[PDB]
Design a protein around this ligand. Structure first.
Ligand SMILES: Cc1nnc2ccc(NCCc3c[nH]c4ccccc34)nn12
Ligand code: NA
Ligand code: NA
Length: 124
């Protein structure tokens, strides 16, 4: 059983466009997306496809870069911090579900360092 994927729209949630959020889509997301290690994170985990019947027994706030991309494209977020929190949830979910040294964790570790490099300095 898969749960429904995270929402990418919510009509009662207030939306905002900011310079930092535009940068998070144009630069941060689109750069990370092309990395050799981005592919496991470009869509919600499909627990039936991937044979991870315990994934959503362990991971209660799932997140992935396909969801983040759609949220940015839909102006779903109020500010850049909210979007950064989604990236952080995505990385930490990977560390939680797996264990140190796993190939997928090495991938997340590399992407997290690139992500931090890109958000170290943001537009005003
Ligand atoms: C995302 C995510 N977070 N924890 C997990 C656990 C499994 C998973 N399957 C994706 C396909 C795959 C299986 N073994 C690998 C090792 C490294 C990179 C990707 C894979 N994705 N996954
Ligand atoms: Na774990
Ligand atoms: Na930057």
């Amino acid at each position: 059983m898969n749960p429904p994927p995270p929402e990418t729209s919510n009509p009662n949630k207030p939306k905002r466009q900011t310079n930092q959020l535009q940068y998070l889509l144009r630069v941060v997301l689109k750069t990370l997306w092309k990395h050799q290690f981005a592919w496991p994170f470009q869509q919600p985990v499909d627990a039936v496809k991937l044979n991870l019947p315990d994934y959503y027994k362990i991971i209660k706030t799932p997140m992935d870069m396909g969801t983040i991309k759609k949220r940015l494209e839909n102006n779903y977020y109020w500010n850049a911090q909210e979007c950064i929190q989604d990236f952080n949830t995505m990385f930490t979910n990977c560390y939680i579900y797996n264990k140190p040294g796993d190939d997928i964790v090495l991938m997340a570790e590399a992407l997290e360092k690139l992500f931090l490099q890109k958000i170290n300095e943001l537009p005003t």
